[PDB]
Amino acid sequence: LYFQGHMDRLITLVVSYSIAFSIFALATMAVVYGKWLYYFEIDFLNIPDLADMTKDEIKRNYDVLITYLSPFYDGALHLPTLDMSTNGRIHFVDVKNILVKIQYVMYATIMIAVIGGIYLLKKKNEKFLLHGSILTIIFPIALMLPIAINFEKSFVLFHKLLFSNDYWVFDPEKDPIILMLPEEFFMHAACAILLFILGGSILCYSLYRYLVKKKR
Ligand SMILES: CCCCCCCC/C=C\CCCCCCCC(=O)OC[C@H](O)CO
Ligand SMILES: CCCCCCCC/C=C\CCCCCCCC(=O)OC[C@H](O)CO
Ligand SMILES: CCCCCCCC/C=C\CCCCCCCC(=O)OC[C@H](O)CO
Ligand SMILES: CCCCCCCC/C=C\CCCCCCCC(=O)OC[C@H](O)CO
Ligand SMILES: CCCCCCCC/C=C\CCCCCCCC(=O)OC[C@H](O)CO
Ligand SMILES: CCCCCCCC/C=C\CCCCCCCC(=O)OC[C@H](O)CO
């Protein structure tokens, strides 16, 4: 009992951070691989005007690129309409590699938390559900203002942090897909992620309080 205390409490520690990360990764893949937001973006930002492309050309290029970024696509990236340089296809491999590593870690934290969670959950201990929501709502709270007021510079730091080359700044001449990827769209995608993080936090917290009311 002196040791089930710690071990259950280390599992509530390990499980808690894996709840936070799993929500982070899940919200990312939902926004990254979701095409509903970007399809709305095409008319809302008037991307045809921005890129001198048609609504059909923009959709298929985005369709092909999003398909290229899945773990289960082993082919190279060829855009239906736009040409691209070797620097351009190095960046999308960088982006593809980042997504794959987040997803690999995400499966671990999703399993760690579901398996280890139900262990502590059926053992009448829900401390991990409060800690999880607190840890994961730190994300939107810390980053809501950086995106809202300083997106352009937060965007650069983000890229500088995650990429070890210069190729993330696209030359419209050699990589014209940058014209159909406006900065406002990535800003909305960052907001959608944070809303899903915040949504998952509230969801995770709704359970905690609801479960604590069960014990009493
Ligand atoms: C079995 C009786 C109750 C069932 C509970 C099973 C126990 C699962 C344990 C830990 C994970 C719980 C996570 C709390 C809920 C979070 C919901 C979620 O993970 O979704 C995040 C969303 O996908 C982000 O975009
Ligand atoms: C029931 C658990 C609740 C968790 C909810 C789903 C869990 C699915 C089950 C197990 C491993 C986790 C896999 C989930 C990851 C798949 C979603 C994802 O991010 O994949 C993107 C895909 O590659 C874009 O093409
Ligand atoms: C994970 C614990 C520490 C978190 C610290 C990181 C802060 C990032 C915050 C929000 C963005 C979340 C995005 C997750 C990864 C983005 C996927 C990606 O590669 O995007 C490429 C980019 O759009 C090409 O311009
Ligand atoms: C009950 C809990 C209350 C809520 C808990 C707070 C946590 C933050 C949640 C979401 C913020 C994330 C998205 C916020 C960023 C939106 C961007 C924005 O609104 O600014 C527009 C932009 O400046 C135009 O130029
Ligand atoms: C600073 C925090 C904000 C960081 C951004 C939030 C994450 C955006 C994620 C998905 C949007 C849709 C992305 C789908 C794939 C985009 C293709 C791409 O990587 O283009 C990047 C561009 O070339 C480089 O400037
Ligand atoms: C009730 C629980 C609430 C939390 C659960 C949320 C789940 C769905 C949230 C958002 C979907 C995507 C909407 C993203 C819209 C991006 C635009 C934005 O949020 O702010 C940008 C601003 O408009 C710049 O001018």
Residue numbers in the entry: -6 to -1, 1 to 210
Wording from the paper:
Here, we report the crystal structure of the Lit enzyme from Bacillus cereus and describe its mechanism of action. Lit consists of four transmembrane helices with an extracellular cap. Conserved residues map to the cap-membrane interface. The reaction involves acyl transfer from the sn-2 position of the glyceryl moiety to the amino group on the N-terminal cysteine of the substrate via an 8-membered ring intermediate.
A hexahistidine N-terminally tagged variant of Lit from B. cereus was over-expressed in E. coli and was crystallised by the in meso method with monoolein as the host lipid. Two structures were solved; one at 2.27 Å, the other at 1.95 Å. The former, in space group P21, displayed type I crystal packing. Root mean-square deviations calculated for Cα atoms in the different structures (211 to 216 residues) range from 0.21 to 0.40 Å. Monoolein molecules from the mesophase in which crystallogenesis occurs coat the protein surface recapitulating the native membrane and occupy a volume inside the protein. These lipids are considered surrogates of the DAG moiety of the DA-BLP substrate and serve to reinforce the view that they sit proximal to the active site of Lit.
